[PDB]
Amino acid sequence: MTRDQNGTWEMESNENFEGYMKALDIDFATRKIAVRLTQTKVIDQDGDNFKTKTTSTFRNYDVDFTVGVEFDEYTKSLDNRHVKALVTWEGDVLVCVQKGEKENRGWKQWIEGDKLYLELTCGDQVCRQVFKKKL
Ligand SMILES: CCCCC/C=C\C/C=C\C/C=C\C/C=C\CCCC(=O)OC(CO)CO
C-alpha cells in the first residue's frame, strides 16, 4: 500500500534530462539553463485525485488529474505541446501515457522508502529523477 505520494519532494538526481529535452526539441539555450536546476515537486493527493506542482527557479509546471480519466494536457512553458494524457495505476506505480506527436511519450512515478522516483520517456530517451521527501 504505497500509492500515497503526498508530500513535498526535493530532487537529488536527474539522469539524462539533457537527452529527454533534446527528444522534445527544446532549444539548446533553454536546455543549458534547465539541465542545471534542482526541481521541487509538491503532490496534493486525495485518493485518485492529484494536484501536482513542479517548481524551479526557471520554470514551474502544474498538472492536475484523476487516475483513470483522460485529460487534455498542454505542457505550457516546457515544450508547449498538446497531448491526450491518461494516468493509470500499474500496481503502485503511477503511469502516464501522453498521446500526441511524439512517440513513446509518458512518465512513471512511484515511492520507495523516503524517495520518489520519476522516469520520463520520449522516443528512445529516458530521464530518471529521484526526489527525497522534505520534512
Ligand atoms: C518544471 C520544472 C522544470 C522545467 C524545466 C524547463 C524547461 C525544459 C523544457 C522541457 C522539458 C520537459 C519537462 C520537464 C520535466 C519535468 C517536470 C514535471 C513534468 C511532469 O509532468 O511531471 C508529472 C509527474 O510528476 C507531474 O505530475
Side-chain angles (χ1 to χ4, degrees):
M1 297 220 161
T2 64
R3 288 183 175 183
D4 187 350
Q5 305 191 346
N6 273 287
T8 296
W9 303 90
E10 184 173 288
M11 171 176 276
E12 66 175 32
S13 61
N14 194 6
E15 170 195 308
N16 193 37
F17 193 45
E18 161 70 13
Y20 173 77
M21 284 189 293
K22 195 170 189 179
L24 289 171
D25 309 296
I26 304 302
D27 73 89
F28 198 25
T30 301
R31 299 201 309 274
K32 250 174 79 160
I33 297 166
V35 76
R36 298 258 272 160
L37 309 176
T38 299
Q39 302 182 22
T40 296
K41 198 173 296 281
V42 176
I43 296 170
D44 172 7
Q45 177 188 354
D46 174 25
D48 281 345
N49 298 324
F50 282 76
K51 298 182 181 178
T52 77
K53 304 174 173 54
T54 303
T55 57
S56 76
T57 186
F58 180 50
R59 305 288 180 73
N60 304 312
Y61 185 65
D62 296 348
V63 64
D64 302 344
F65 54 83
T66 297
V67 182
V69 179
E70 180 172 277
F71 65 102
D72 290 306
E73 183 182 6
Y74 170 52
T75 54
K76 184 177 184 64
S77 302
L78 302 179
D79 63 316
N80 296 294
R81 287 190 170 90
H82 297 274
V83 299
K84 292 289 185 180
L86 176 64
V87 183
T88 52
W89 288 112
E90 294 185 7
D92 298 344
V93 179
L94 200 62
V95 177
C96 179
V97 174
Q98 290 167 317
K99 180 174 173 53
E101 293 305 305
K102 293 296 185 182
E103 291 191 274
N104 196 35
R105 185 187 180 153
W107 52 257
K108 301 186 179 178
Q109 185 166 279
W110 71 96
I111 300 296
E112 298 183 29
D114 72 339
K115 303 208 169 173
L116 179 149
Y117 296 79
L118 175 59
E119 296 196 343
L120 302 125
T121 300
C122 186
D124 70 354
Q125 299 294 319
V126 184
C127 167
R128 288 177 186 87
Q129 303 182 341
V130 184
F131 298 76
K132 188 165 180 177
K133 208 173 190 293
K134 293 238 155 304
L135 300 184

